[PDB]
RNA sequence: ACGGAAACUUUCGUAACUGUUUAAUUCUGUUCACUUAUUC
């Protein structure tokens, strides 16, 4: 009836990425775009948004079934995965992503 | 050298007792700080 399905994994980077994040200041040696950290500590971490962004777009390029133009009105077989805020049958999405924080300062040091 | 002369409709007493503009309601549904790039 109502059941909550939690996708527990550690992601592991194998190569340095390069997201930008708010302003240039996360350390005295910048000059372009850092990278987004924590407001309260000083831990690199990488937000949800940026998830959504890309796993949605290299999804529905093979299991869509009309060449799109714009979000949220393309391949309605995984439109209520995501959301879509122009059909009347469903708005709310059925799956929620977390911030990802680093957890690996426990042994990094 | 008047059917006149003498004389408070006056004294007393809250329009009063009682009583939620109340019950119900996410300012949210879609959104990579991105695209091209030999520290040689």
Same mark, same amino acid.
Do not use: Y
């Given at each position: 009836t109502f059941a909550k399905i939690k996708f527990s994994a550690q992601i592991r980077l194998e190569t340095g990425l390069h997201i930008g994040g708010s302003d +240039? $200041? +996360? +350390? *005295?040696?910048?000059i372009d775009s850092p990278v987004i950290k924590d407001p309260i500590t000083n831990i690199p971490i990488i937000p949800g948004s940026s998830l959504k962004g890309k796993m949605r777009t290299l999804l529905a390029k093979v299991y869509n079934e009309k060449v799109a133009? /714009?979000? !949220? @009105? @393309? !391949? @309605? *077989? &995984?439109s209520r995965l995501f #959301? =879509? !805020? /122009? @059909? /009347?049958? $469903? /708005?709310? #999405?059925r799956l929620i992503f977390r911030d990802a924080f &680093? !957890? =690996? +300062?426990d042994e990094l040091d």
């Open positions: +240039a $200041f +996360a +350390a *005295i040696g910048a133009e /714009k979000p !949220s @009105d @393309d !391949s @309605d *077989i &995984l #959301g =879509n !805020s /122009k @059909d /009347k049958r $469903f /708005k709310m #999405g &680093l !957890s =690996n +300062a």
